[PDB]
Amino acid sequence: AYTNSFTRGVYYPDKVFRSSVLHSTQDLFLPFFSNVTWFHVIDNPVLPFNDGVYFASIEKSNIIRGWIFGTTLDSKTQSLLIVNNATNVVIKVCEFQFCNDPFLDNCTFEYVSFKNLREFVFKNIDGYFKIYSKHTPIDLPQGFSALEPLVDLPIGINITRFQTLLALHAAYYVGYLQPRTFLLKYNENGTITDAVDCALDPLSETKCT
Amino acid sequence: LTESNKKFLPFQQFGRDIADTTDAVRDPQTLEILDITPCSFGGVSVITP
Numbered sequence: 001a002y003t004n005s006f007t008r009g010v011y012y013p014d015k016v017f018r019s020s021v022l023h024s025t026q027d028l029f030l031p032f033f034s035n036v037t038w039f040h041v042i043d044n045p046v047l048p049f050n051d052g053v054y055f056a057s058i059e060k061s062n063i064i065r066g067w068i069f070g071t072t073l074d075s076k077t078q079s080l081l082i083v084n085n086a087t088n089v090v091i092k093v094c095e096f097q098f099c100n101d102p103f104l105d106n107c108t109f110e111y112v113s114f115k116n117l118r119e120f121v122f123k124n125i126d127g128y129f130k131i132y133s134k135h136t137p138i139d140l141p142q143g144f145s146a147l148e149p150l151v152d153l154p155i156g157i158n159i160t161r162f163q164t165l166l167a168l169h170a171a172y173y174v175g176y177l178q179p180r181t182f183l184l185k186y187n188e189n190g191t192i193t194d195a196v197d198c199a200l201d202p203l204s205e206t207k208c209t
Numbered sequence: 210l211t212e213s214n215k216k217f218l219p220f221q222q223f224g225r226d227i228a229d230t231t232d233a234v235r236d237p238q239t240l241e242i243l244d245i246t247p248c249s250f251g252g253v254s255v256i257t258p
C-alpha cells in the first residue's frame with residue numbers, strides 16, 4: 001500500500017544554532033508529500049536501503065521491536081540488527097540468522113541502552129549509520145516536527161538492504177530520501193519550526209530564493 | 210569569551226551569526242554556551258595642526 005508523507009521526516013542537517021534566522025541548505029532528505037510504502041502486519045518483507053530510508057510506525061504496544069540492516073540479509077554479511085528488548089535498545093551487527101518467522105520472543109559491535117508514534121530516518125555515509133529518530137505518544141500526523149539524531153553509529157559497516165521485525169510470545173510506513181534543497185526556520189531556541197522544500201511548488205521556490 | 214546564558218539544543222555544539230560567522234560554542238569542559246566576540250580594533254586618525 002501507499003500514502004502521503006505529510007511534511008514529515010525533516011531532521012537537523014547541521015548542529016549550527018540560529019536564533020530567528022531563516023537558513024537554506026542542500027542535503028539528502030525526504031521529499032515533501034512524497035509517496036511512502038505502506039505495509040500492515042497480517043508482513044515484514046525485505047526492502048532495499050537505497051540512498052536513505054524513512055520509517056514511521058504507530059503502535060500502542062510497539063509490535064515492531066527490531067530492524068535488521070544488511071546487504072544480503074542471509075548471514076553472509078555483517079547485518080546491523082537494532083532490536084529493542086524491554087527498555088533496552090540493543091544494536092548489533094551479528095552474522096547469526098534470526099528465527100524462521102522473524103519475530104522476537106560475528107558480532108563486532110554491541111550497544112545496549114496506536115498511542116505511541118515512532119519516526120525514523122536512516123542513511124549511511126562513510127560507514128557511519130546515521131539515525132534521525134523520535135519517540136513520542138500521540139495514517140501519518142499532519143503537523144510539522146523536527147527529527148533529532150538520537151544515535152549515530154560509528155560502526156563503519158556497509159549496508160544496502162533492510163528488513164523490519166515483529167514480536168510475539170502493526171502499521172508502518174517506509175520512505176526513501178532524495179537530494180532536495182530546503183529552507184529552514186530556526187526559532188529563538190534553535191528548534192526547526194518550519195521547512196520549505198524548494199523542489200515542490202513555485203511558491204516554495206519563491207520562499208527559497 | 211563571555212559569561213553567556215545562551216540555550217542550545219543538546220546536539221548543537223556550535224552556533225553561527227546571520228552571516229554564518231561562529232558566534233557561540235559549547236565548551237567541552239563546561240556544556241553551557243559561551244558567546245564569542247573577537248577583540249576590539251579601529252582605524253587610527255591623527256588630529257594635528
Ligand SMILES: *[C@@H]1O[C@H](CO)[C@@H](O[C@@H]2O[C@H](CO)[C@@H](O)[C@H](O)[C@H]2NC(C)=O)[C@H](O)[C@H]1NC(C)=O
Nearest residue numbers: 083084085086088089090091092110111112113
Ligand atoms: C536484552 O538484550 C540485551 C542484549 O543482549 C541484554 O543485555 C546485555 O546482553 C549482553 C550480551 O551478553 C551482556 O553482556 C550484558 O551484560 C547485558 N546487559 C547490559 C546492561 O548490557 C539483556 O539481558 C536483554 N534483556 C532481556 C530481558 O532479555
Ligand SMILES: *[C@@H]1O[C@H](CO)[C@@H](O)[C@H](O)[C@H]1NC(C)=O
Nearest residue numbers: 002003004005033034035036
Ligand atoms: C502513491 O502511489 C499509489 C500507487 O501508485 C497511489 O495509489 C497513491 O495515490 C500515491 N500517493 C501519492 C501521494 O501520490
Ligand SMILES: *[C@@H]1O[C@H](CO)[C@@H](O)[C@H](O)[C@H]1NC(C)=O
Nearest residue numbers: 071072077127157158159160
Ligand atoms: C556494499 O555491499 C554490497 C553487496 O556486497 C555491494 O554491492 C556494495 O558495492 C557495497 N558498498 C560498499 C561501499 O562497499
Ligand SMILES: *[C@@H]1O[C@H](CO)[C@@H](O)[C@H](O)[C@H]1NC(C)=O
Nearest residue numbers: 187188189190191215216217
Ligand atoms: C525559549 O527558551 C526560553 C528560556 O527562558 C523560554 O522562556 C521560551 O519560552 C522558549 N521559547 C521561545 C519560543 O522563545
